[PDB]
Symmetry: C3
Subunit: 278 residues, 3 copies
């Protein structure tokens, strides 16, 4: 493999993170005050890394930070039950740990932390963060395994109820690439409804990475994946591979969801920057 | 393996295909005028084959042909956005390509086109073919990999909203086999609802083919699979294997869906042609 | 592997089983009269075992016993269509068989019976057991493969409509373990709604066993699994592995389902018996 690969982990990382009420009524996470985003900023670490997140709740209600898949003690649960949320104006240091796969003492195989995970609030609105998740307090986490193929860019599409990334329907989001780009998509589903993410002209493997290890990988290859609340998956694709440039749309394939406007455009450009038809 | 296996692909195939309004108000695809069917005719190719489909829209509304999983340029998208639908009375030549898996230049593994896919309309009713799919404009596509085990027969069951193959509830469809037959089922889900396809007395592997490669295949073995709009899977079973002949029913396992009449019969006969109990 | 492993099967087991109307209006299965439970008693066998179940319907309505995944002749279908239910006060002997994986005569690989399966009624209320399943006539079946890692304890959580194990919402069930225990969870979904089972601080492999074979297992590692009616999966976890002791909650992640009270506690204790925070 002559592509860029993820290195071995084991670094202790430090992060500052804020929960912010936005002008439009939404709430979002951010690395800087006044720079909150919906979805929240992407957190990407390697297996074995430890992450210390100094989380400050700038909001006037209790907020928290709860992560999937990663290792964390009960004190970083992010739940009210476990005294792990953050008072308004307060600041709390969460700790997320990751680990490499390996053989246990009993001879069994312990899985690693690698995967496409996500974080979200767990105390806003209800004791399960129904209000915070609805308002936009969610974000992706990528834990890479040593040797994982690294992409040229990573895009996050979050199916939050009847919206993509809390955007108004019929407004995308659209993103761009050039034929041959290695594009990584992180997909998170939140809310109350099930969905089916479909992508025109592209396909991926239904496994951890979206890529096949080789000729022996039995993982099914799909272009349509069913998804439910708190499901997080991701994949990589070669933009326009075998299909060329064009406005390749993606959408939920529940018929009235795509009719509602749960549609976006994966704009793959020719090397001259143009898209067939425009 | 002394069973019939799929050969290597690479042939350029040509197909004529029509979109037809049926007498009962449905719309269906067909290879011959007056011979349209719901679901549409099965298209089965090998990895590496190229398929040229001369599609004629005999209907009085705009129709199109959109396929999953297979390679196609933006001009064969089958969408109105990409000027790829067909005017009433018009004729357009779509091109679907398939490719074998292989090593990329960067050393990564490119997946093949093999799988249980499907095609459907994308412009009737709405810009996502909600009307065409509802009316019956859908059909299965099978792309085989070299060496894939070939069945004795292939049956298509499409869960379109609250119907099997757009049939009236409580009317099947039923199909037959003899104990020992290698039966292939292609399952496509369309519409607005999620379902769970269940089969009495039989089970399959939850992978691309429904079959295990061997003792090292980690794919789970199931008899109940959750499914959503535009999901397409398939499998093969030995009829009556380990269970004998009988009227083995299949149904959606959502309780009121099977109560509604989303039930069919997999009639497996003894070598004398009889079914236990009848 | 120095952990306890499942032995080779091939024993002919005999079981007595009752269908009982409970005082609160529910119906449940049991091995002894007056000792019925919801969910029903766990049945655990090895691949190759044969199970003879003398089933007695103590109820005043027709009841039956239908199993998933296991081998059974048409006479043990448990359906009214196949004359396989049990009259009120009647007694019928069902036979479930299991088989090991192996090579077929044609050279193909026949899958084994191993997996996390379940049994339920099929004639109470409707011809699909909608009434019996609702009333609590469901139970887990575990078929082990030779060499499968054996747990310290097994817990069954059944998502029946808007309840866990037909319990009142906000009432668990909760169960306990000590840090380091090998805990097995069997998850069955019944009824009309889809769900997503999520577990704090723990994760498992999305395959047959919930465990990875080793460094070559491509199965995705998850902590959130979408599930529908008659879906049955299971996994094993090391309680508190990498996260420590604490009140680790599990819940459906459909937002108002967890808000409704579809939440339980996986109480992992320190070696001194205490849970952090209490
Ligand atoms: Cu939670
Ligand atoms: Cu949707
Ligand atoms: Cu498509
Ligand atoms: Cu969550
Ligand atoms: Cu589409
Ligand atoms: Cu259904
Ligand atoms: Cu069944
Ligand atoms: Cu489609
Ligand atoms: Cu059934
Ligand atoms: Cu639920
Ligand atoms: Cu969680
Ligand atoms: Cu069932
Ligand atoms: O589509
Ligand atoms: O069933
Ligand atoms: O959560």
């Amino acid at each position: 493999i002559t592509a860029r690969t993820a290195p071995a982990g084991g670094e202790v990382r430090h992060l500052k993170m804020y929960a912010e009420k936005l002008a439009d009524g939404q709430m979002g996470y951010g690395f800087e005050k006044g720079k909150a985003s919906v979805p929240g900023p992407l957190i990407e670490v390697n297996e074995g890394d430890t992450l210390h997140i100094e989380f400050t709740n700038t909001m006037d209600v209790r907020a928290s930070l709860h992560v999937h898949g990663l290792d964390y003690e009960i004190s970083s649960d992010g739940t009210a039950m476990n005294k792990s949320d953050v008072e308004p104006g307060g600041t709390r240091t969460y700790t997320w740990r990751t680990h490499k796969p390996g053989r246990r003492d009993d001879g069994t195989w312990r899985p690693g932390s690698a995967g496409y995970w996500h974080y979200h609030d767990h105390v806003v609105g209800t004791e399960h963060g129904t209000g915070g998740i609805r308002n936009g307090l969610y974000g992706p986490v990528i834990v890479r395994r040593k040797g994982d193929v690294l992409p040229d860019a990573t895009h996050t599409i979050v199916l939050n109820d009847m919206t993509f990334n809390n955007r108004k329907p019929h407004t995308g989001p659209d993103f761009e690439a050039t034929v041959g780009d290695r594009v990584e998509i992180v997909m998170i589903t939140h809310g109350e409804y099930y969905h089916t993410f479909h992508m025109h002209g592209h396909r991926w493997a239904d496994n951890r990475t979206g890529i096949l290890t080789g000729p022996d990988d039995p993982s099914r290859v799909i272009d349509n994946k069913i998804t439910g609340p708190a499901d997080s998956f991701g994949f990589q694709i070669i933009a326009g591979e075998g299909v060329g440039a064009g406005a390749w749309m993606y959408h939920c394939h529940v018929q009235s969801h795509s009719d509602m406007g749960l549609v976006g455009l994966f704009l793959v450009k020719k090397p001259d920057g143009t898209i067939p038809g425009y």
